[PDB]
Design a protein around this ligand. Structure first.
Ligand SMILES: Nc1ncnc2c1ncn2[C@@H]1O[C@H](COP(=O)(O)OP(=O)(O)O)[C@@H](O)[C@H]1O
Lengths: 192, 338, 192, 192, 130
């Protein structure tokens, strides 16, 4: 059950759900397996906040084990499109897609919690059918692999060759290791 | 006490395209003056006042129709707005303040004030304050309002002049934009969203003319007007719209036409002015898009003539001046003849 | 759950769902497997917006893997019927049915995000029963194939022969490749 | 999640679901397989609209792959019973039961979109049990078949013999074909 | 600016003005917020300009005041933010010269004082010539 909170305003007392109250403060929660429906919801929140104030910065809290690539690209493309800088904070973990979205945040505004765990791997897919169809889908996933690696190299700042080697197999990076790799910029240890 | 037909002829001189509305006001105003003219009241029957309700779009000539009648038959004229009186605090003093304003024009003559014609507008806004309507109906139904005698430092209750509002003609003008949809629902098909519905919102609003003419008391109550207030407004006059072509005619056809006013100003200066038909469409088109009706015509013409008016007195050798559609756009300069 | 949002108006503060709030701005979300139920919901949204303002454009956001042809065809006919232009934007991906609706958008208003993937294929179906019945259903699906290819050629601008050859098997098109093919017009890289 | 739409009038502002907002405009949505529960809901809408105004026409948008015959007859008998003329518009498709309701609409007020597919077939049924019971049920379905053919012939205008031969097996029809057959009166292509 | 130009009678009525009063005033002259360039001219071009006023004030004490061309641009920028029009200029000048005016009478050997753009920002102190 989602709890309800009261917000004091000039008009009077107002009741909001815990998630909507934080949305009012430009906070979007990315939680669980990435998919088309949850991604479209996040896209709607980014566009809504852009209109309210295109100057202020938006925040994205990523705690997810990854998911569909196509759904993630909808979020990634939306972040780069809108004028507001999107700050990404990793809570708990950030897998292949969560990590791609984490590093896709605005340069200097990417954060990670101290005990967080980041993991990056290459795309995984499968197709059953004729050899001709296999060649088509096989070429498509390879293109996505190259495209994802090219974008990660840009945000992380590492060379494309290095990304291919590291993403060939699952690689787990802690919060300090991620800072060196370039996935995140700083760690939020304590409130200052 | 000219006949209604004669009154319509006078209105036709200054107002064009609202012939149907002129007929309703001509007969209605004629009856009001006939009752005042028939002060003898020989018959045992007591005559009752008839109040008109004008429903038309903005800048359609509702206000102009009010004072124009007073110009023909000399009577004091005052105008009020419902938004001014929606305060709902001490409404009694403002309703009597309106006649006080009217009394100023008539030299504070109670008899002359009673014969005066009062006008109001934007009645749609109050329809939904409900309380404001409770006070307004009393003024239309008839009420005696005390007013101070021609101002003064102070005066006692005895000297206060009391004018009966039962003999005053009240015209509660308004612009009911959303009422047309209510009439279509009642008269035409009750479909506005589906495939078979009529969503031809081309902005022409030609159908609105005959649609609003079918106004009945049922559609008004849906708009929020209480039935008691509607009963005090038996006469209803409806203005259709001011078309682009109609605006062109208003620029020159009226007696004190806008073009004539500017032309006269240039004539005394020593140079005549010529308005090409091409310039008229540009001015009319701008007003239609702006949605100002005839009101914007004055502003558009002044802006176009502002530059030349500044330099023409200083400049000389301009035998004649001409205007074209290009000048209205602002890219071109008014042609000068030497 | 969907996060509620507040809209300021002359009357006062009003509460709207995230999707309903965007619907007020003439934005319709086409998400997931196309089916009769969701299609009728999109159709109702279009008709409603047409009544409010037939002059203003409508924006359809497509992120779906395709689905039923009959359900998708009810959306296409609705778009062409209504007077306002229906702009189509592709987020994440637009498969066979999603691509047909995407290219069916108003000329010059079709857009695609840079990382979106547009896939087009021919109709697929099946039937079990007597040979006489199989002949009836086989002729029907083939007629549908020609109908879809005829319309796709009209919007894309390519010849019917080329569309038939290209759509004989699954064909994946990136956002730039889609521009040349004619499925879309421009790419919304960044807000200007 | 159906979206919520706000209707603004002089009296005030009201919030309705998209389906209920269109109901005020005498628009009923028939979607999915026909059944007793969905059919009962459609019947309630017809009676409610009849009470509000028995003169204004009622619109019925049909997109359904047929269903139970008994449930359909409730809708058909209700349409003929009520004074208001029930218009029928086919969106996407209209199978056996949907087509029967489509052609059952008021003469001159039956429409179909250009790409709609209309299919008509004879009833389908089965019974397991004793031979005596089989004869009872077999006679019943044949009586239903003849009754449906007679009604379809009346609305379509075709001869009873022609309807029997055509409905022996599935017969897919297009919007132009339906016009000449008599199932529909006109095709709605563009609002003009 | 660019908003008051679209003024109409309906908005004036909401403010409280009587509708009849508005109709009797057809001509409407709407002014616009002074620009940076306009404020710069007022600082020196008028005979009774703000700079000349302080120059006469300093001259009464035996010192001459000089204003750099760049300083006027900075003063105009600060004045525009205040939104008080021409009166904003006096606020900036009084603040920048508050310290020197307090100590200038007590100080000796001061024959000339110069102000530049850096002084307007407040990071620098008024330049003194000895
Ligand atoms: N037919 C017309 N002929 C001349 N002037 C008109 C006409 N219709 C409107 N006007 C102008 O519109 C002005 C009144 O506008 P307003 O009172 O705001 O709305 P309404 O015209 O509905 O009363 C008048 O000054 C008048 O000059």
């Amino acid at each position: 059950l989602v709890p309800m909170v009261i917000e004091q305003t000039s008009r009077g007392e107002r009741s909001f759900d815990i998630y909507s109250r934080l949305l009012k403060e430009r906070v979007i929660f990315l939680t669980g397996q990435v998919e088309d429906h949850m991604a479209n919801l996040i896209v709607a929140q980014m566009l809504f906040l852009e209109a309210e104030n295109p100057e202020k910065d938006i925040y994205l809290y990523i705690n997810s084990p990854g998911g569909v690539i196509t759904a993630g690209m909808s979020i990634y493309d939306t972040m780069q499109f809108i004028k507001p800088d999107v700050s990404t904070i990793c809570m708990g973990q950030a897998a292949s897609m969560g990590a791609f979205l984490l590093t896709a945040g605005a340069k200097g505004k990417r954060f990670c919690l101290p005990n967080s765990r980041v993991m990056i791997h290459q795309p995984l897919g499968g197709y059953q059918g004729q050899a001709t169809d296999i060649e088509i889908h096989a070429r498509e996933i390879l293109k996505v692999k190259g495209r994802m690696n090219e974008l990660m190299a840009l945000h992380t700042g590492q060379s494309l060759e290095q990304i291919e080697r590291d993403t060939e197999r699952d690689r787990f990076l802690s919060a300090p290791e991620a800072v060196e790799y370039g996935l995140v910029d700083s760690i939020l240890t304590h409130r200052n | 006490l000219p006949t209604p037909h004669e009154i319509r002829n006078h209105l036709d001189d200054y107002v064009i395209g609202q012939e149907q509305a002129k007929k309703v006001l001509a007969v209605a105003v004629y009856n009001h003056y006939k009752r005042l003219r028939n002060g003898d009241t020989s018959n045992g029957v007591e005559l009752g006042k008839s109040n008109i309700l004008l429903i038309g779009p903005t800048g359609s000539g509702k206000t102009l129709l009010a004072e124009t009648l007073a110009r023909l038959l000399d009577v004091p004229f005052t105008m009020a707005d419902a938004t001014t009186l929606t305060e709902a605090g001490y409404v009694g003093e403002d309703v009597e303040n309106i006649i006080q304003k009217l009394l100023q024009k008539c030299d504070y003559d109670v008899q002359k004030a009673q014969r005066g014609i009062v006008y109001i507008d934007e009645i749609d806004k109050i329809s939904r304050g409900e309380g404001v309507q409770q006070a307004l109906l009393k003024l239309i139904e008839g009420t005696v309002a005390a007013v101070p005698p021609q101002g003064g430092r102070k005066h006692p209750q005895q000297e206060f002049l009391q004018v009966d509002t039962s003999k005053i003609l009240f015209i509660c003008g308004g612009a009911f934009a959303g009422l047309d949809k209510v009439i279509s629902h009642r008269v035409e098909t009750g479909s506005g969203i589906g495939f078979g519905a009529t969503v031809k919102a081309k902005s022409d609003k030609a159908s609105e003319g005959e649609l609003l003419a079918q106004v009945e008391p049922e559609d008004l109550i849906k708009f929020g007007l209480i039935p008691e207030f509607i009963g005090r407004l038996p006469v209803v006059a409806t203005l259709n719209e001011l078309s682009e072509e109609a605006l062109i005619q208003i620029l020159k056809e009226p007696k004190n036409a806008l073009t004539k006013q500017y032309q006269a100003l240039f004539n005394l200066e020593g140079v005549d002015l010529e308005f090409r038909d091409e310039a008229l469409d540009a001015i009319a088109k701008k007003a239609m898009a702006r949605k100002t009706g005839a009101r914007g015509l004055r502003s558009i013409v002044e802006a176009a003539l502002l530059d030349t008016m500044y330099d023409l007195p200083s400049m000389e050798d301009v035998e004649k001046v001409v205007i074209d559609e290009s000048v209205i756009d602002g890219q071109s300069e008014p042609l000068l003849i030497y």
